[PDB]
Ligand binder design. Structure first.
Ligand SMILES: [Cl-]
Ligand SMILES: [Cl-]
Ligand SMILES: [Cl-]
Ligand SMILES: [Cl-]
Ligand SMILES: [Cl-]
Ligand SMILES: [Cl-]
Ligand SMILES: [Cl-]
Ligand SMILES: [Cl-]
Ligand SMILES: [Cl-]
Ligand SMILES: [Cl-]
Ligand SMILES: [Cl-]
Ligand SMILES: [Cl-]
Ligand SMILES: [Cl-]
Ligand SMILES: [Cl-]
Ligand SMILES: [Fe+3]
Ligand SMILES: [Fe+3]
Ligand SMILES: [Fe+3]
Ligand SMILES: [Fe+3]
Ligand SMILES: [Fe+3]
Ligand SMILES: [Fe+3]
Ligand SMILES: [Fe+3]
Ligand SMILES: [Fe+3]
Ligand SMILES: [Fe+3]
Ligand SMILES: [Fe+3]
Ligand SMILES: [Fe+3]
Ligand SMILES: [Fe+3]
Ligand SMILES: [Fe+3]
Ligand SMILES: [Fe+3]
Ligand SMILES: [Fe+3]
Ligand SMILES: [Fe+3]
Ligand SMILES: [Fe+3]
Ligand SMILES: [Fe+3]
Ligand SMILES: [Fe+3]
Ligand SMILES: [Fe+3]
Ligand SMILES: [Fe+3]
Ligand SMILES: [Fe+3]
Ligand SMILES: [Fe+3]
Ligand SMILES: [Fe+3]
Ligand SMILES: [Fe+3]
Ligand SMILES: [Fe+3]
Ligand SMILES: [Fe+3]
Ligand SMILES: [Fe+3]
Ligand SMILES: [Fe+3]
Ligand SMILES: [Fe+3]
Ligand SMILES: [Fe+3]
Ligand SMILES: [Fe+3]
Ligand SMILES: [Fe+3]
Ligand SMILES: [Fe+3]
Ligand SMILES: [Fe+3]
Ligand SMILES: [Fe+3]
Ligand SMILES: [Fe+3]
Ligand SMILES: [Fe+3]
Ligand SMILES: [Fe+3]
Ligand SMILES: [Fe+3]
Ligand SMILES: [Fe+3]
Ligand SMILES: [Fe+3]
Ligand SMILES: [Fe+3]
Ligand SMILES: [Fe+3]
Ligand SMILES: [Fe+3]
Ligand SMILES: [Fe+3]
Ligand SMILES: [Fe+3]
Ligand SMILES: [Fe+3]
Ligand SMILES: [Fe+3]
Ligand SMILES: [Fe+3]
Ligand SMILES: [Fe+3]
Ligand SMILES: [Fe+3]
Ligand SMILES: [Fe+3]
Ligand SMILES: [Fe+3]
Ligand SMILES: [Fe+3]
Ligand SMILES: [Fe+3]
Ligand SMILES: [Fe+3]
Ligand SMILES: [Fe+3]
Ligand SMILES: [Fe+3]
Ligand SMILES: [Fe+3]
Ligand SMILES: [Fe+3]
Ligand SMILES: [Fe+3]
Ligand SMILES: [Mg+2]
Ligand SMILES: [Mg+2]
Ligand SMILES: [Mg+2]
Ligand SMILES: [Mg+2]
Ligand SMILES: [Mg+2]
Ligand SMILES: [Mg+2]
Ligand SMILES: [Mg+2]
Lengths: 159, 159, 159, 159, 159, 159, 159
């Protein structure tokens, strides 16, 4: 097993956990402070996504190839974006950074001739683009209407 | 809303998140290092429990009564118990401490005449005893047999 | 049986009856004067709630523990809020006062060592918070959009 | 719209509310003090009848023809009939007075050439006679047997 | 675990066992000596209630919190009430005393900050009032009719 | 009716009640102290057997033939066997004594030419042998394996 | 088509055939000599896997891209591992070597810009890790218990 891939995947595990905890806070704020419970449910589903399969796939993959899991988590939510559009724009920015880290891991697996890892990362390559697409669709709405309740209703059909 | 109850519930939110992240690591170790995948699935279900409804009930309760959510999370898993029995014994110890914190919150709600909070905490009072009972049943097995595969098979029927 | 609990529960019976009659008027006004029939149906359901189980639970509880029922009802609706948002804001204020009276009854039952009464009041402790949450969700909409028909459509899915 | 019909219908709304609150008390007393829970359920159904459709039909009719609703309610139950037969005899007397008020409203609608109102009142003309028939059937039983449990059993099949 | 709560719950276990054995005798006598087999089945169901879940909940609760079970039972039925009404009146008296013991245990749990115990006792707080209500409904019948077969038939529908 | 049969059956009623209360304690101890919850459920089913039909058949038989029921119960569980095998061995000993008392009642019924009683006792003659067979099958396991969890699993299929 | 990829895939075809024939022998020995028929069925399923789709996918892929199939097979099973744990440990070693050959083919396809081949090999990259995981799970059991029949029973649920 590759130590650099092991480290890179342990950092991605850490990123998904910390992002998931931030999104859970953002989801609470979207509902409570911004009166957009469907925006909150959208962000909450992203939170459970990062804290669910996004982190468990890595821990399960480690079991198979003899890599070691590291749990080292530090996250504090110290400021909140000022309104709902800024809130989901901040979610978009974090999701775009996820794509960059995933790209680095794919590049490294090919450099290490670690084709089991390149394969494993394929899911994340795809899911990074679709999570970002789902978020971008929501960011769209805030530039498409000035009525929070119209946006809310549109979110309800986007699940 | 009570500031002391708000602080006490924010600390319990923090405890459930951090416990959930530790259990996820313990579940990985139970399977990978100790060859007890059903012990791992038992601990993993506890992890999803703490990181799921145990934390979301608090955030949802805050939305209703005007309390504020705090996300301040710090956890590192720096040593692992040496074998499976010590692993689940350590889970038992953490679950027993949960009962003590839950008791303090119930006592405080009555002191504050905060009966909505005393009510909310009732679930946790009960779930604290049953989570501890489920864990204690697993600790039982390691003193009841010296065969890991017998214990494993018994865990598989305890879900 | 406690005379003070009996008096406190008889006043709560009186409050639920009088609130129910006011809400029935408010529901009529929401539909007829303000053109918001779904706001009216929301308020009408609150009216039937107070005039239904909220009052009958008390009368039934009295049958069990030997307390006496008092019927002494006086209510006149002499002014109406000027628009729909003020109408539902006034409903919110009344529902928040209900929480305070419920809290006093819980405190008194513990003071009297009347644990059957503390138990009975638990439903009301919970229902006070959820009725207030349902009303607060509707008050949200009037600060989320300036289009009565958008608010109306959003109410129709909130039942 | 007719002001006299509006006033006459507002008084009938007031009568149905106040009668409904009295019957709810009578139903409680029939069960608790007189040991006739089925007599109580009979009277309770009359209570929900007056406090339900009997009052809501008027408020809904007002929405259609531009009449105004008045909520002005004053009722105290200060004495209770001494036994069950007197209790249901008192219910009969109140129901018979309802017929007289309904008759006055029908007479007035014809005098005003208000045929929408004469039509609306037709339901009440009929329901006044059948409510009084249902009550009279129960009053029958107390002159037909001296055994409360026989009367109770007969009430249970009369719904 | 609290020693005083342990003792108080062990005495309640003892009370439910001894009451259950007395009711089983009373049920036999209601059928055989008093010709009221449905009164007997009513009392027999109370007997199985006390000797069933009323005692097993305590023993199961002890397993969870580390309290010890005591079995110390002494009961002799040395006199029987003279007729059926006195028989069920005596059942009522015993059930009313159960409420008082349950109240003492709830008061003690709050005094000990034993919120798991206060929670456990909630069932008994409620069941004490409803068992007493069921018995009181049967005592009602003996003051409502002088015909044992009418009372019997009424009991058959009260289960 | 025979006075000696009446006395012999009243003593058997007393034996089944007292045995049932002891088994309920033994079942609690098998689960809590010995970590054998399925052994506990086996013993608990024996407890409900003695406290159920084993005692009610006698009380019902008395109703038919004019014998009198006596309730005189005295039982204290003052020592517990030291381990699970001794626990079920003690259950076996008590069940074997039941066979001897049942035999004495059958012998007495034939001596009294009480053929209704000899018939009634036939069930007990049979059930005495099968209850003892069920218990003996469990005692078998403790001499067949030294692993409590293997024994536990075998008990789970023996119901 | 690449001659080096053609040669590398023809060697992998040869490896899967020869491994499949060895596993078929090992499966026979696991059942017959070692009394572990479920271990035998596990190894037999691996045998049919290598001799089935693992070899036919290659021959079918050759049909599509114009590569030539070579059949050149030489295998003799001349010694058998001494016990069951050594038997499955030897299976593990062979499966781990399969991963190395699969890795070389993936590396070569990228070197040849043969992306149809890199794609085809992806299945094998994944199946190499899961076949090795399935085998490793069985090797686990021999270090988890010293009872062949416990291991056998555990294998039966692992299919
Ligand atoms: Cl941070
Ligand atoms: Cl690889
Ligand atoms: Cl830490
Ligand atoms: Cl409160
Ligand atoms: Cl007023
Ligand atoms: Cl109480
Ligand atoms: Cl009045
Ligand atoms: Cl007209
Ligand atoms: Cl006694
Ligand atoms: Cl507690
Ligand atoms: Cl004794
Ligand atoms: Cl005979
Ligand atoms: Cl060879
Ligand atoms: Cl290509
Ligand atoms: Fe919400
Ligand atoms: Fe996903
Ligand atoms: Fe950070
Ligand atoms: Fe903005
Ligand atoms: Fe995702
Ligand atoms: Fe996704
Ligand atoms: Fe829509
Ligand atoms: Fe729409
Ligand atoms: Fe739609
Ligand atoms: Fe596994
Ligand atoms: Fe749970
Ligand atoms: Fe920490
Ligand atoms: Fe250890
Ligand atoms: Fe839980
Ligand atoms: Fe739980
Ligand atoms: Fe087994
Ligand atoms: Fe099994
Ligand atoms: Fe099984
Ligand atoms: Fe309308
Ligand atoms: Fe409700
Ligand atoms: Fe008022
Ligand atoms: Fe306004
Ligand atoms: Fe409500
Ligand atoms: Fe409600
Ligand atoms: Fe719309
Ligand atoms: Fe819609
Ligand atoms: Fe819709
Ligand atoms: Fe009743
Ligand atoms: Fe009607
Ligand atoms: Fe009046
Ligand atoms: Fe009279
Ligand atoms: Fe009517
Ligand atoms: Fe009617
Ligand atoms: Fe009938
Ligand atoms: Fe009948
Ligand atoms: Fe009938
Ligand atoms: Fe009978
Ligand atoms: Fe019950
Ligand atoms: Fe006694
Ligand atoms: Fe008497
Ligand atoms: Fe009960
Ligand atoms: Fe009950
Ligand atoms: Fe009859
Ligand atoms: Fe009947
Ligand atoms: Fe009937
Ligand atoms: Fe258990
Ligand atoms: Fe049986
Ligand atoms: Fe004894
Ligand atoms: Fe022993
Ligand atoms: Fe039996
Ligand atoms: Fe049996
Ligand atoms: Fe089995
Ligand atoms: Fe098994
Ligand atoms: Fe089985
Ligand atoms: Fe075979
Ligand atoms: Fe396969
Ligand atoms: Fe070879
Ligand atoms: Fe070996
Ligand atoms: Fe394969
Ligand atoms: Fe495979
Ligand atoms: Fe099995
Ligand atoms: Fe099985
Ligand atoms: Mg390279
Ligand atoms: Mg206080
Ligand atoms: Mg006090
Ligand atoms: Mg005219
Ligand atoms: Mg205190
Ligand atoms: Mg003879
Ligand atoms: Mg190249």
């Amino acid at each position: 097993k590759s130590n650099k891939i092991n480290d890179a995947l342990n950092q991605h595990y850490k990123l998904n956990v910390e992002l998931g905890l931030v999104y859970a806070h953002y989801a609470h704020v979207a509902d409570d402070e911004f009166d957009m419970p469907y925006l909150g449910k959208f962000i909450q589903h992203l939170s459970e996504d990062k804290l669910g399969v996004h982190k468990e796939y890595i821990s399960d993959y480690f079991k198979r190839n003899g890599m070691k899991l590291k749990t080292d988590v530090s996250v504090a939510v110290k400021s909140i974006p000022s309104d709902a559009k800024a809130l989901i724009q901040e979610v978009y920015a974090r999701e775009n950074e996820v794509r960059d880290h995933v790209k680095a891991i794919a590049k490294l697996a090919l450099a290490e001739d670690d084709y089991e890892s390149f394969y494993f990362i394929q899911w994340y390559v795809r899911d990074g683009l679709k999570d970002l697409t789902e978020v971008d669709d929501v960011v769209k709405l805030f530039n498409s209407s000035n009525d929070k309740l119209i946006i809310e209703e549109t979110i309800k059909e986007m699940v």
